[PDB]
């Protein structure tokens with residue numbers, strides 16, 4: 196689990212979203228595994244507006260933060276699961292690192308702020324859903 200709280204928004208993995216999240220839907224995108232919902236409290240997370248390719252992420256399956264190098268956001272093929280069939284997920288960034296399904300939601304951070312959240316993984320790889328392009332999270 197895990198979410199980003201910025202301003203009047205909550206950013207979660209679309210596969211892990213709750214009933215409240217859908218009842219207060221702002222935006223959702225299946226191809227990105229992203230869901231944004233409205234909140235009754237003001238969020239304090241800073242979203243990075245950058246080109247960074249290095250950061251640190253939280254891996255709850257290890258109770259540790261890991262520094263990683265990661266790829267530019269792109270379309271990557273993701274194996275079929277119980278939430279989605281076999282498809283290309285967009286805005287996805289891969290890194291070499293420990294990952295487990297319950298690890299989705301873990302924040303990826305750089306010097307500039309929050310980059311995105313854990314969304315895919317397996318075989319010594321971890322994939323992060325990018326949120327740096329969503330300029331409206333600040334306006």
Ligand SMILES: COc1ccncc1CC(=O)N1CCC[C@H](C(N)=O)C1
Pocket residue numbers: 210228273276278279284294295296297298299313314315316317
């Ligand atoms: C962090 O997740 C994992 C890590 C290691 N083995 C497996 C996983 C699980 C994973 O990749 N998923 C399953 C749930 C939906 C995901 C998606 N975006 O389509 C894909």
Ligand SMILES: [Zn+2]
Pocket residue numbers: 243244245246247305306307308
């Ligand atoms: Zn940055």
